[PDB]
Amino acid sequence: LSEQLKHCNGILKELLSKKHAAYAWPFYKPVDASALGVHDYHDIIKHPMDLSTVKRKMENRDYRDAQEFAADVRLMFSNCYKYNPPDHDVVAMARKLQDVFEFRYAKMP
Ligand SMILES: CCNC(=O)[C@H](C)[C@@H]1N=C(c2ccc(Cl)cc2)c2cc(OC)ccc2-n2c(C)nnc21
Ligand SMILES: C[C@H](O)COC[C@H](C)O
Ligand SMILES: [Cl-]
């Protein structure tokens, strides 16, 4: 991994760590639309994303730069903001995790 991608990997590890689990947990695995009963999810969200998918892409060296990584993490939050009402509990969690993400991403070497 490039130096910037190492920073990205560090951010990813932090997002998945116990420190943030109280608000990060919904983002750990792909949304299971059937399990959650959200039968319109895949009509509304054309490009699902979640932290396990970002992790697999990082491990496989799929991301060629920090910008590509950040686009995926941001897509994950955007999908949450698109599907859910802005006052929803999961949206509040998304905002908190995105704050953690954006502030550390801003510290890119
Ligand atoms: C109809 C209620 N809304 C949902 O079920 C959405 C689809 C779902 N909510 C939730 C969700 C709803 C309430 C709370 Cl407190 C936390 C997460 C959710 C739950 C999950 O459990 C494994 C996984 C993903 C989500 N999730 C994410 C991420 N983005 N939207 C959601
Ligand atoms: C609340 C917005 O959806 C995300 O804001 C991120 C900022 C770093 O708090
Ligand atoms: Cl972006």
mmCIF file of N, CA and C and ligand atoms in Angstrom:
data_model
loop_
_atom_site.group_PDB
_atom_site.id
_atom_site.type_symbol
_atom_site.label_atom_id
_atom_site.label_comp_id
_atom_site.label_asym_id
_atom_site.label_seq_id
_atom_site.Cartn_x
_atom_site.Cartn_y
_atom_site.Cartn_z
ATOM 1 N N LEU A 1 0.823 -1.205 0.000
ATOM 2 C CA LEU A 1 0.000 0.000 0.000
ATOM 3 C C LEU A 1 0.858 1.256 0.000
ATOM 4 N N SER A 2 0.419 2.269 -0.743
ATOM 5 C CA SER A 2 1.054 3.577 -0.690
ATOM 6 C C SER A 2 0.892 4.176 0.705
ATOM 7 N N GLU A 3 1.647 5.227 0.978
ATOM 8 C CA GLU A 3 1.578 5.890 2.269
ATOM 9 C C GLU A 3 0.171 6.413 2.581
ATOM 10 N N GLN A 4 -0.452 7.048 1.600
ATOM 11 C CA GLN A 4 -1.810 7.532 1.784
ATOM 12 C C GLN A 4 -2.796 6.380 2.007
ATOM 13 N N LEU A 5 -2.621 5.281 1.280
ATOM 14 C CA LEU A 5 -3.468 4.107 1.484
ATOM 15 C C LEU A 5 -3.259 3.448 2.849
ATOM 16 N N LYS A 6 -2.050 3.546 3.401
ATOM 17 C CA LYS A 6 -1.819 3.082 4.766
ATOM 18 C C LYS A 6 -2.638 3.916 5.737
ATOM 19 N N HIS A 7 -2.668 5.233 5.531
ATOM 20 C CA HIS A 7 -3.489 6.102 6.373
ATOM 21 C C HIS A 7 -4.956 5.687 6.251
ATOM 22 N N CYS A 8 -5.401 5.414 5.024
ATOM 23 C CA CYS A 8 -6.774 4.957 4.807
ATOM 24 C C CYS A 8 -7.048 3.661 5.558
ATOM 25 N N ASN A 9 -6.103 2.727 5.488
ATOM 26 C CA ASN A 9 -6.278 1.467 6.186
ATOM 27 C C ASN A 9 -6.366 1.685 7.689
ATOM 28 N N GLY A 10 -5.587 2.631 8.202
ATOM 29 C CA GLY A 10 -5.666 2.970 9.612
ATOM 30 C C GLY A 10 -7.039 3.501 10.000
ATOM 31 N N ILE A 11 -7.569 4.405 9.187
ATOM 32 C CA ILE A 11 -8.921 4.916 9.384
ATOM 33 C C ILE A 11 -9.928 3.768 9.402
ATOM 34 N N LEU A 12 -9.815 2.871 8.431
ATOM 35 C CA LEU A 12 -10.739 1.749 8.328
ATOM 36 C C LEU A 12 -10.705 0.878 9.587
ATOM 37 N N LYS A 13 -9.505 0.565 10.060
ATOM 38 C CA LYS A 13 -9.362 -0.197 11.287
ATOM 39 C C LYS A 13 -10.040 0.531 12.447
ATOM 40 N N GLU A 14 -9.846 1.841 12.523
ATOM 41 C CA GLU A 14 -10.495 2.606 13.581
ATOM 42 C C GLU A 14 -12.022 2.564 13.474
ATOM 43 N N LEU A 15 -12.560 2.718 12.266
ATOM 44 C CA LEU A 15 -14.013 2.660 12.087
ATOM 45 C C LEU A 15 -14.592 1.328 12.553
ATOM 46 N N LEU A 16 -13.799 0.261 12.440
ATOM 47 C CA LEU A 16 -14.222 -1.087 12.819
ATOM 48 C C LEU A 16 -13.904 -1.460 14.270
ATOM 49 N N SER A 17 -13.273 -0.543 14.998
ATOM 50 C CA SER A 17 -12.801 -0.825 16.351
ATOM 51 C C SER A 17 -13.873 -0.629 17.426
ATOM 52 N N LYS A 18 -13.632 -1.207 18.598
ATOM 53 C CA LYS A 18 -14.599 -1.162 19.691
ATOM 54 C C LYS A 18 -14.952 0.264 20.105
ATOM 55 N N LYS A 19 -13.972 1.161 20.028
ATOM 56 C CA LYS A 19 -14.162 2.577 20.348
ATOM 57 C C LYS A 19 -15.421 3.183 19.715
ATOM 58 N N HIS A 20 -15.726 2.779 18.483
ATOM 59 C CA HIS A 20 -16.842 3.369 17.744
ATOM 60 C C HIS A 20 -18.013 2.422 17.512
ATOM 61 N N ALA A 21 -17.976 1.253 18.139
ATOM 62 C CA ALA A 21 -18.946 0.203 17.831
ATOM 63 C C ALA A 21 -20.398 0.595 18.090
ATOM 64 N N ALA A 22 -20.623 1.481 19.058
ATOM 65 C CA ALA A 22 -21.982 1.867 19.430
ATOM 66 C C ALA A 22 -22.748 2.508 18.271
ATOM 67 N N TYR A 23 -22.037 3.194 17.374
ATOM 68 C CA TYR A 23 -22.681 3.817 16.217
ATOM 69 C C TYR A 23 -22.187 3.229 14.893
ATOM 70 N N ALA A 24 -21.092 2.477 14.920
ATOM 71 C CA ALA A 24 -20.564 1.913 13.678
ATOM 72 C C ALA A 24 -21.221 0.603 13.266
ATOM 73 N N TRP A 25 -21.811 -0.112 14.223
ATOM 74 C CA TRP A 25 -22.260 -1.486 13.952
ATOM 75 C C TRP A 25 -23.184 -1.668 12.738
ATOM 76 N N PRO A 26 -24.101 -0.718 12.471
ATOM 77 C CA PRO A 26 -24.955 -0.964 11.299
ATOM 78 C C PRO A 26 -24.181 -1.034 9.985
ATOM 79 N N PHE A 27 -22.970 -0.483 9.959
ATOM 80 C CA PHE A 27 -22.187 -0.345 8.735
ATOM 81 C C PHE A 27 -21.185 -1.476 8.536
ATOM 82 N N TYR A 28 -21.189 -2.446 9.442
ATOM 83 C CA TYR A 28 -20.196 -3.512 9.410
ATOM 84 C C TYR A 28 -20.356 -4.455 8.224
ATOM 85 N N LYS A 29 -21.600 -4.747 7.846
ATOM 86 C CA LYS A 29 -21.869 -5.735 6.798
ATOM 87 C C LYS A 29 -22.901 -5.185 5.808
ATOM 88 N N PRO A 30 -23.011 -5.785 4.611
ATOM 89 C CA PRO A 30 -23.991 -5.260 3.652
ATOM 90 C C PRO A 30 -25.399 -5.237 4.221
ATOM 91 N N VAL A 31 -26.165 -4.204 3.896
ATOM 92 C CA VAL A 31 -27.575 -4.201 4.261
ATOM 93 C C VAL A 31 -28.246 -5.448 3.697
ATOM 94 N N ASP A 32 -28.897 -6.208 4.571
ATOM 95 C CA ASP A 32 -29.660 -7.387 4.158
ATOM 96 C C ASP A 32 -31.113 -6.972 4.071
ATOM 97 N N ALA A 33 -31.529 -6.600 2.869
ATOM 98 C CA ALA A 33 -32.826 -5.958 2.687
ATOM 99 C C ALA A 33 -33.965 -6.871 3.115
ATOM 100 N N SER A 34 -33.881 -8.141 2.744
ATOM 101 C CA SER A 34 -34.919 -9.089 3.114
ATOM 102 C C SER A 34 -34.995 -9.270 4.627
ATOM 103 N N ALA A 35 -33.843 -9.421 5.271
ATOM 104 C CA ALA A 35 -33.812 -9.623 6.715
ATOM 105 C C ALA A 35 -34.433 -8.440 7.442
ATOM 106 N N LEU A 36 -34.186 -7.236 6.930
ATOM 107 C CA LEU A 36 -34.694 -6.015 7.558
ATOM 108 C C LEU A 36 -36.104 -5.646 7.114
ATOM 109 N N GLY A 37 -36.634 -6.365 6.131
ATOM 110 C CA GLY A 37 -37.967 -6.089 5.631
ATOM 111 C C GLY A 37 -38.068 -4.868 4.736
ATOM 112 N N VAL A 38 -36.930 -4.371 4.246
ATOM 113 C CA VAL A 38 -36.920 -3.168 3.415
ATOM 114 C C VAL A 38 -36.893 -3.543 1.933
ATOM 115 N N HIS A 39 -38.060 -3.935 1.438
ATOM 116 C CA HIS A 39 -38.178 -4.531 0.112
ATOM 117 C C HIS A 39 -38.015 -3.539 -1.036
ATOM 118 N N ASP A 40 -37.865 -2.266 -0.694
ATOM 119 C CA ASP A 40 -37.589 -1.230 -1.687
ATOM 120 C C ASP A 40 -36.131 -0.777 -1.686
ATOM 121 N N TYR A 41 -35.323 -1.355 -0.803
ATOM 122 C CA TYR A 41 -33.962 -0.870 -0.595
ATOM 123 C C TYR A 41 -33.154 -0.870 -1.890
ATOM 124 N N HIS A 42 -33.214 -1.962 -2.644
ATOM 125 C CA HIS A 42 -32.404 -2.077 -3.853
ATOM 126 C C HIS A 42 -32.985 -1.364 -5.071
ATOM 127 N N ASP A 43 -34.222 -0.899 -4.949
ATOM 128 C CA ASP A 43 -34.781 0.006 -5.949
ATOM 129 C C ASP A 43 -34.301 1.441 -5.724
ATOM 130 N N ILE A 44 -34.016 1.782 -4.471
ATOM 131 C CA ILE A 44 -33.614 3.128 -4.084
ATOM 132 C C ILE A 44 -32.093 3.279 -4.072
ATOM 133 N N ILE A 45 -31.400 2.230 -3.638
ATOM 134 C CA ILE A 45 -29.950 2.233 -3.499
ATOM 135 C C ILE A 45 -29.357 1.357 -4.589
ATOM 136 N N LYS A 46 -28.806 1.981 -5.625
ATOM 137 C CA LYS A 46 -28.291 1.218 -6.757
ATOM 138 C C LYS A 46 -26.863 0.718 -6.537
ATOM 139 N N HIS A 47 -26.154 1.318 -5.583
ATOM 140 C CA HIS A 47 -24.759 0.954 -5.327
ATOM 141 C C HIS A 47 -24.489 0.784 -3.845
ATOM 142 N N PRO A 48 -24.880 -0.368 -3.295
ATOM 143 C CA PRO A 48 -24.712 -0.621 -1.860
ATOM 144 C C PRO A 48 -23.238 -0.597 -1.469
ATOM 145 N N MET A 49 -22.957 -0.205 -0.234
ATOM 146 C CA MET A 49 -21.586 -0.223 0.253
ATOM 147 C C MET A 49 -21.622 -0.376 1.762
ATOM 148 N N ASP A 50 -20.573 -0.981 2.308
ATOM 149 C CA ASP A 50 -20.469 -1.199 3.742
ATOM 150 C C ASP A 50 -19.009 -1.424 4.098
ATOM 151 N N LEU A 51 -18.695 -1.416 5.389
ATOM 152 C CA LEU A 51 -17.300 -1.501 5.815
ATOM 153 C C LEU A 51 -16.604 -2.824 5.501
ATOM 154 N N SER A 52 -17.336 -3.943 5.509
ATOM 155 C CA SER A 52 -16.711 -5.226 5.153
ATOM 156 C C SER A 52 -16.292 -5.228 3.690
ATOM 157 N N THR A 53 -17.072 -4.552 2.857
ATOM 158 C CA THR A 53 -16.760 -4.479 1.442
ATOM 159 C C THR A 53 -15.531 -3.595 1.220
ATOM 160 N N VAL A 54 -15.480 -2.468 1.923
ATOM 161 C CA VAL A 54 -14.313 -1.594 1.874
ATOM 162 C C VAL A 54 -13.070 -2.348 2.359
ATOM 163 N N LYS A 55 -13.214 -3.117 3.436
ATOM 164 C CA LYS A 55 -12.104 -3.907 3.968
ATOM 165 C C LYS A 55 -11.586 -4.928 2.957
ATOM 166 N N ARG A 56 -12.495 -5.654 2.314
ATOM 167 C CA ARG A 56 -12.091 -6.635 1.307
ATOM 168 C C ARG A 56 -11.385 -5.962 0.130
ATOM 169 N N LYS A 57 -11.902 -4.815 -0.299
ATOM 170 C CA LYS A 57 -11.270 -4.074 -1.380
ATOM 171 C C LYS A 57 -9.867 -3.609 -0.991
ATOM 172 N N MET A 58 -9.694 -3.142 0.241
ATOM 173 C CA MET A 58 -8.369 -2.733 0.697
ATOM 174 C C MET A 58 -7.408 -3.916 0.727
ATOM 175 N N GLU A 59 -7.861 -5.036 1.279
ATOM 176 C CA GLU A 59 -7.031 -6.236 1.387
ATOM 177 C C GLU A 59 -6.598 -6.740 0.013
ATOM 178 N N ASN A 60 -7.484 -6.597 -0.966
ATOM 179 C CA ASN A 60 -7.236 -7.055 -2.327
ATOM 180 C C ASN A 60 -6.525 -6.018 -3.171
ATOM 181 N N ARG A 61 -6.176 -4.886 -2.565
ATOM 182 C CA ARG A 61 -5.488 -3.793 -3.261
ATOM 183 C C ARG A 61 -6.329 -3.253 -4.412
ATOM 184 N N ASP A 62 -7.639 -3.247 -4.220
ATOM 185 C CA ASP A 62 -8.557 -2.750 -5.233
ATOM 186 C C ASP A 62 -8.442 -1.228 -5.370
ATOM 187 N N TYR A 63 -8.287 -0.534 -4.245
ATOM 188 C CA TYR A 63 -8.184 0.919 -4.277
ATOM 189 C C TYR A 63 -6.824 1.347 -4.773
ATOM 190 N N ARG A 64 -6.804 2.186 -5.796
ATOM 191 C CA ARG A 64 -5.525 2.635 -6.306
ATOM 192 C C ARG A 64 -5.055 3.913 -5.629
ATOM 193 N N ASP A 65 -5.970 4.624 -4.976
ATOM 194 C CA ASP A 65 -5.576 5.800 -4.212
ATOM 195 C C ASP A 65 -6.576 6.125 -3.106
ATOM 196 N N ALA A 66 -6.202 7.075 -2.255
ATOM 197 C CA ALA A 66 -7.032 7.470 -1.121
ATOM 198 C C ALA A 66 -8.391 7.988 -1.572
ATOM 199 N N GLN A 67 -8.420 8.699 -2.690
ATOM 200 C CA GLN A 67 -9.669 9.262 -3.191
ATOM 201 C C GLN A 67 -10.699 8.184 -3.519
ATOM 202 N N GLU A 68 -10.239 7.080 -4.092
ATOM 203 C CA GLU A 68 -11.151 5.986 -4.401
ATOM 204 C C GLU A 68 -11.717 5.356 -3.126
ATOM 205 N N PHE A 69 -10.868 5.163 -2.125
ATOM 206 C CA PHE A 69 -11.301 4.682 -0.819
ATOM 207 C C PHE A 69 -12.334 5.617 -0.204
ATOM 208 N N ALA A 70 -12.046 6.913 -0.196
ATOM 209 C CA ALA A 70 -12.947 7.875 0.424
ATOM 210 C C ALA A 70 -14.296 7.913 -0.275
ATOM 211 N N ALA A 71 -14.292 7.803 -1.600
ATOM 212 C CA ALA A 71 -15.545 7.779 -2.346
ATOM 213 C C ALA A 71 -16.439 6.624 -1.879
ATOM 214 N N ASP A 72 -15.852 5.448 -1.647
ATOM 215 C CA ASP A 72 -16.638 4.303 -1.169
ATOM 216 C C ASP A 72 -17.184 4.511 0.242
ATOM 217 N N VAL A 73 -16.353 4.998 1.160
ATOM 218 C CA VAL A 73 -16.831 5.245 2.522
ATOM 219 C C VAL A 73 -17.964 6.272 2.493
ATOM 220 N N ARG A 74 -17.800 7.311 1.683
ATOM 221 C CA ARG A 74 -18.830 8.334 1.575
ATOM 222 C C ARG A 74 -20.113 7.823 0.913
ATOM 223 N N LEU A 75 -19.971 6.944 -0.078
ATOM 224 C CA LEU A 75 -21.110 6.278 -0.698
ATOM 225 C C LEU A 75 -21.934 5.511 0.339
ATOM 226 N N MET A 76 -21.249 4.793 1.226
ATOM 227 C CA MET A 76 -21.895 4.061 2.308
ATOM 228 C C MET A 76 -22.765 4.985 3.167
ATOM 229 N N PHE A 77 -22.226 6.129 3.565
ATOM 230 C CA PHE A 77 -23.022 7.083 4.328
ATOM 231 C C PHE A 77 -24.166 7.666 3.497
ATOM 232 N N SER A 78 -23.881 8.036 2.252
ATOM 233 C CA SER A 78 -24.905 8.611 1.381
ATOM 234 C C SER A 78 -26.099 7.684 1.188
ATOM 235 N N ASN A 79 -25.841 6.385 1.068
ATOM 236 C CA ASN A 79 -26.923 5.419 0.894
ATOM 237 C C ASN A 79 -27.830 5.455 2.112
ATOM 238 N N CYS A 80 -27.219 5.592 3.283
ATOM 239 C CA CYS A 80 -27.977 5.663 4.528
ATOM 240 C C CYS A 80 -28.846 6.923 4.563
ATOM 241 N N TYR A 81 -28.259 8.056 4.167
ATOM 242 C CA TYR A 81 -28.976 9.335 4.104
ATOM 243 C C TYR A 81 -30.055 9.339 3.024
ATOM 244 N N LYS A 82 -29.860 8.567 1.959
ATOM 245 C CA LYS A 82 -30.853 8.508 0.894
ATOM 246 C C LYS A 82 -32.075 7.694 1.302
ATOM 247 N N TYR A 83 -31.836 6.539 1.911
ATOM 248 C CA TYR A 83 -32.925 5.613 2.175
ATOM 249 C C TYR A 83 -33.783 6.030 3.369
ATOM 250 N N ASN A 84 -33.131 6.527 4.408
ATOM 251 C CA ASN A 84 -33.782 6.771 5.685
ATOM 252 C C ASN A 84 -34.177 8.225 5.910
ATOM 253 N N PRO A 85 -35.263 8.459 6.659
ATOM 254 C CA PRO A 85 -35.621 9.839 7.014
ATOM 255 C C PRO A 85 -34.507 10.479 7.834
ATOM 256 N N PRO A 86 -34.329 11.798 7.710
ATOM 257 C CA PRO A 86 -33.182 12.455 8.347
ATOM 258 C C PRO A 86 -33.206 12.415 9.876
ATOM 259 N N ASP A 87 -34.360 12.135 10.470
ATOM 260 C CA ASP A 87 -34.452 12.062 11.930
ATOM 261 C C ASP A 87 -34.309 10.638 12.463
ATOM 262 N N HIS A 88 -33.991 9.688 11.585
ATOM 263 C CA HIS A 88 -33.909 8.284 11.985
ATOM 264 C C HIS A 88 -32.674 7.987 12.838
ATOM 265 N N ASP A 89 -32.809 7.054 13.778
ATOM 266 C CA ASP A 89 -31.679 6.625 14.598
ATOM 267 C C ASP A 89 -30.444 6.222 13.783
ATOM 268 N N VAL A 90 -30.636 5.484 12.694
ATOM 269 C CA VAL A 90 -29.479 5.017 11.928
ATOM 270 C C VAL A 90 -28.756 6.182 11.250
ATOM 271 N N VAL A 91 -29.512 7.216 10.902
ATOM 272 C CA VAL A 91 -28.925 8.406 10.303
ATOM 273 C C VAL A 91 -28.050 9.155 11.310
ATOM 274 N N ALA A 92 -28.497 9.227 12.559
ATOM 275 C CA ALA A 92 -27.698 9.849 13.606
ATOM 276 C C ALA A 92 -26.384 9.095 13.791
ATOM 277 N N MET A 93 -26.452 7.774 13.709
ATOM 278 C CA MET A 93 -25.259 6.952 13.827
ATOM 279 C C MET A 93 -24.318 7.209 12.650
ATOM 280 N N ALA A 94 -24.883 7.265 11.446
ATOM 281 C CA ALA A 94 -24.113 7.584 10.246
ATOM 282 C C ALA A 94 -23.385 8.924 10.386
ATOM 283 N N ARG A 95 -24.085 9.949 10.873
ATOM 284 C CA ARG A 95 -23.471 11.270 11.027
ATOM 285 C C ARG A 95 -22.276 11.202 11.978
ATOM 286 N N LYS A 96 -22.432 10.476 13.078
ATOM 287 C CA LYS A 96 -21.349 10.340 14.045
ATOM 288 C C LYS A 96 -20.144 9.606 13.467
ATOM 289 N N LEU A 97 -20.391 8.504 12.773
ATOM 290 C CA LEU A 97 -19.286 7.753 12.186
ATOM 291 C C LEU A 97 -18.631 8.555 11.059
ATOM 292 N N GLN A 98 -19.432 9.307 10.311
ATOM 293 C CA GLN A 98 -18.864 10.113 9.243
ATOM 294 C C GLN A 98 -18.015 11.249 9.805
ATOM 295 N N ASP A 99 -18.400 11.785 10.959
ATOM 296 C CA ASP A 99 -17.551 12.768 11.624
ATOM 297 C C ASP A 99 -16.187 12.158 11.953
ATOM 298 N N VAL A 100 -16.178 10.949 12.517
ATOM 299 C CA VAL A 100 -14.919 10.276 12.818
ATOM 300 C C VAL A 100 -14.101 10.123 11.532
ATOM 301 N N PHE A 101 -14.763 9.667 10.478
ATOM 302 C CA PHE A 101 -14.095 9.470 9.205
ATOM 303 C C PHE A 101 -13.509 10.756 8.616
ATOM 304 N N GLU A 102 -14.328 11.798 8.507
ATOM 305 C CA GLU A 102 -13.889 12.998 7.800
ATOM 306 C C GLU A 102 -12.755 13.701 8.530
ATOM 307 N N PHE A 103 -12.825 13.742 9.854
ATOM 308 C CA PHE A 103 -11.765 14.424 10.587
ATOM 309 C C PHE A 103 -10.427 13.699 10.483
ATOM 310 N N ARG A 104 -10.444 12.373 10.501
ATOM 311 C CA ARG A 104 -9.187 11.649 10.345
ATOM 312 C C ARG A 104 -8.709 11.614 8.888
ATOM 313 N N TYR A 105 -9.642 11.508 7.949
ATOM 314 C CA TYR A 105 -9.280 11.562 6.531
ATOM 315 C C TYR A 105 -8.581 12.894 6.198
ATOM 316 N N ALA A 106 -9.047 13.970 6.825
ATOM 317 C CA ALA A 106 -8.460 15.296 6.646
ATOM 318 C C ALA A 106 -6.998 15.360 7.101
ATOM 319 N N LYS A 107 -6.581 14.432 7.962
ATOM 320 C CA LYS A 107 -5.203 14.399 8.459
ATOM 321 C C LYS A 107 -4.281 13.566 7.569
ATOM 322 N N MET A 108 -4.725 13.311 6.342
ATOM 323 C CA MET A 108 -3.935 12.600 5.339
ATOM 324 C C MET A 108 -2.512 13.146 5.191
ATOM 325 N N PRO A 109 -1.496 12.270 5.294
ATOM 326 C CA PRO A 109 -0.116 12.709 5.053
ATOM 327 C C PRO A 109 0.068 13.193 3.620
HETATM 328 C C1 LIG B 1 -37.111 0.642 7.907
HETATM 329 C C2 LIG B 1 -36.041 1.026 8.903
HETATM 330 N N1 LIG B 1 -34.828 1.295 8.218
HETATM 331 C C3 LIG B 1 -33.922 0.256 7.900
HETATM 332 O O1 LIG B 1 -34.168 -0.907 8.206
HETATM 333 C C4 LIG B 1 -32.656 0.640 7.166
HETATM 334 C C5 LIG B 1 -32.627 0.028 5.779
HETATM 335 C C6 LIG B 1 -31.472 0.147 7.968
HETATM 336 N N2 LIG B 1 -31.567 0.518 9.348
HETATM 337 C C7 LIG B 1 -30.774 -0.051 10.236
HETATM 338 C C8 LIG B 1 -30.825 0.438 11.659
HETATM 339 C C9 LIG B 1 -32.035 0.844 12.190
HETATM 340 C C10 LIG B 1 -32.088 1.304 13.494
HETATM 341 C C11 LIG B 1 -30.927 1.369 14.249
HETATM 342 CL CL1 LIG B 1 -30.993 1.950 15.889
HETATM 343 C C12 LIG B 1 -29.716 0.968 13.721
HETATM 344 C C13 LIG B 1 -29.665 0.504 12.417
HETATM 345 C C14 LIG B 1 -29.689 -1.053 9.878
HETATM 346 C C15 LIG B 1 -29.606 -2.177 10.675
HETATM 347 C C16 LIG B 1 -28.651 -3.105 10.322
HETATM 348 O O2 LIG B 1 -28.576 -4.234 11.156
HETATM 349 C C17 LIG B 1 -27.560 -5.174 10.898
HETATM 350 C C18 LIG B 1 -27.796 -2.958 9.240
HETATM 351 C C19 LIG B 1 -27.912 -1.798 8.470
HETATM 352 C C20 LIG B 1 -28.866 -0.829 8.782
HETATM 353 N N3 LIG B 1 -29.040 0.198 7.909
HETATM 354 C C21 LIG B 1 -28.104 0.968 7.308
HETATM 355 C C22 LIG B 1 -26.601 0.849 7.432
HETATM 356 N N4 LIG B 1 -28.653 1.920 6.529
HETATM 357 N N5 LIG B 1 -30.012 1.758 6.641
HETATM 358 C C23 LIG B 1 -30.171 0.724 7.473
HETATM 359 C C1 LIG B 2 -23.748 15.305 8.999
HETATM 360 C C2 LIG B 2 -23.256 15.125 7.583
HETATM 361 O O1 LIG B 2 -24.081 14.196 6.922
HETATM 362 C C3 LIG B 2 -21.832 14.622 7.621
HETATM 363 O O2 LIG B 2 -21.018 15.610 8.206
HETATM 364 C C4 LIG B 2 -19.681 15.224 8.409
HETATM 365 C C5 LIG B 2 -18.992 16.252 9.278
HETATM 366 C C6 LIG B 2 -17.513 15.949 9.330
HETATM 367 O O3 LIG B 2 -19.537 16.203 10.577
HETATM 368 CL CL CL B 3 -15.621 11.805 -2.710
#
